[model samples]
Target: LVHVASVEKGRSYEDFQKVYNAIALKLREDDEYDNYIGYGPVLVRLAWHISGTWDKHDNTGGSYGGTYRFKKEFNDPSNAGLQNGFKFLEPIHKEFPWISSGDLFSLGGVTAVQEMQGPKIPWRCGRVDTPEDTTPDNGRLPDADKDAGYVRTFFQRLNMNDREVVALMGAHALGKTHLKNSGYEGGGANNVFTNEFYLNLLNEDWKLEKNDANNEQWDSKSGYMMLPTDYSLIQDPKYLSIVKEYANDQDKFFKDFSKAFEKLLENGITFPKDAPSPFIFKTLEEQGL
Candidate 1:
């Protein structure tokens, strides 16, 4: 399970930059979907879901494989609504047919985050595609209805520490959970990318309730919701401190999120020591979009 770094043949920084631009431009044009919240949130969620399958113990089921293209992974119950994110990247893949599925999937998330005015997630491009047989089985992703101990233990398989888990969960700020897709409804923002997940966790007065799907969740009148795992941040003493820090200082949250996200995508892959430093692409705004 030692995946060596191998950049796509004849590809360089500019090549990936072109891919990034295509994703960002489409994100702007396709702003009317999902209640006009745009594709940015789902793209980020897609990226996370793709990478979240990694098991640090054996380095299996990670973004490195790009096996989601196969029927098994694509049809995963945990990935019910992610087909939209996959379809969004389909044209980009066709246009840049040389890019591996793994690279395309991971980069799409990076592009979405940066374009949405989130942090600059350093990205690498050396994930060669594997065959459908390589696709991992379903059920690697975490459950939404869980307690603080379950949340902590679940992430341990991915090799995330308390701080990393909390920082990564901050991504809840971007998207809402569909009752049909995840049996949970509403999170925060649903469009813009911010540290609002942490802020909402700390500031909002949440009440426990069951949605139409008959699943327990935290609800608030502000049109926001929190999964039990999300609420665990405030309930756990150690996680609460980190949550407060991120809620109070947006800059710190962004910085920590950038690092944790990069690590999340790289969890199961083994990059050679001499591999180039992670590339930080120029935002569309920086490019005068």
Candidate 2:
């Protein structure tokens, strides 16, 4: 349960920066994936799903183990659409064979966020891979068809509070869901990360409708869609205020997301006092690449 930070052998900031750049450059080149939504959102979700497996009780599953590389976790029903994210990182892993699976997966999310005009998610680089037996079973991730109470209680298992839960859910703005992947379909899509999730929730004229899959999702006139869990943000009083706050303040949303995301990725890992400070990678635009 005590997975301490261990810097990859002889590796430091420079090595990770190279890996980050590689991922970012490929993100720019692959413009057709997910219908021009690109790999940014999927990479973000990949990091989330890998880290989301954490139990927070005995620290059973987490990004610390890098267990998502295994077939059981990789093929989890909840992770249906994330294979694209895994496939996208294959080349980056091939080039930077020295980096651990956990580190590469987590850092891929960070790079995608920054390159897509999102926040700077400070990241560490010391998630050593565990064996196949360590992978957590399926059904650990949240279900989309649930209500506010279910969403609230479900996140507690991952040790995420309301603010953290709301912030993390904002990532839904990045990519549209596919019916084949999650029993829901998207109307329009967005590649860049933003606070639009909150905005759409508060401002849109949504109708209760079902897609071809016979699953109920709130559909908006703008061609945007929201799962029952997403719409729940505005349904509950406590969540409604938080949603309104994020919708009105872009800076607050970005800052909260950065902290929550870093925490989400770092859960279940114990960082040694001597471990290096988290690295803030330069975006491709900043590096003039």
Candidate 3:
């Protein structure tokens, strides 16, 4: 696997952090997406879904090149509502055209997680553009309609451990299932929750109902919905323990999530252990300078 050299020509960490501040500021200003809630959760999901396609065995795909901005990858059914995320990031790309797609996409994930009060995910820049043919085929993403065995095996292909799988799914608490987007609907009250996904799993009596649009809804008394796949976390015994662990401790969840999210983004590449310590880049608001 050929790892691209870091982007040291045009943008340094300081300059890119300025770009991060720009994107972070945009995320705060653009808080009117998907019914006035915000684009935070979906953007995080976007980054994860895009990077999730990586296969460590062949090193053919990964977030090394942010190709989702292209039509073939963009139109993927699994990435239904991510157009909003792209639109949100467009201005930042325009502002800093020199920044690589890999940098912007991973930075977007970092900005989203931080703004949403999740742990800060350290990121790096070096992903270069690949041809359209290199864009991964669809179906690389996890299906919301699938089950525990499916979820477990699906993540294993990405090289995620049980703890990592549980940590990553915690992001589900922040976003709702969009019926128009994924043929599913309603996971949280306002599409704006914390890692409460596990708590919802433990407390809610999920009723499998179809939305008006014929999408599945794991409706509960708290006005949340969990996809069949999401519910499988607790329904399956092995997955349930980790779900319980996150439900019980936010710190542990954040630690595991920060590490795993970075790992997902860094798939197919190697970094020197002593090269640079992971950086918790500040959001636009935090970087008042």
Best by lDDT: 2
Residue range 1-289, candidate 1, lDDT tens digits: 7887798987889989999999999999998888888899899888988999888888888899899999999999999999999999999999999999999999999999998899999999999888888898999999988889999999999899999999999888886888789888776446667888998888889999989999999999898999888898899999999999998999999999999999988888888887777899999899998
Q: Which segments of model 1 are wrong by more than 4 Å? A: none
Name the weakest run of 10 consecutive residues (lDDT summed) in model 1. 184-193
Q: List candidate 3 stretches off by more than 4 Å.
A: 189-193, 272-277
- Span of ten consecutive residues with least summed lDDT in model 2: 185-194
What value does the lDDT take at residue 169 in candidate 2? 92
lDDT string, candidate 2, 1-289, tens digits: 6888799999989999999999999999998997888999899999999999899889889898889999999899999989999999999999989899999999989998899899999999899998999999998998989999999998998899999999999999988889899899985778888899999998899999989999999998889999999999999999999999999999999999999999999999999989999999999888888
By lDDT, rank the candidates, best first: 2, 1, 3
* Residue-level lDDT for 50 in candidate 1: 90
Instruction: Count steric clashes of candidate 3.
Output: 1
RMSD after CA superposition, every candidate: 1.0, 0.8, 1.9
lDDT of 3: 0.79
The deviation in Å at residue 194 for candidate 1 is 1.5
The candidate, 1 or 3, that scores higher on TM-score is 1
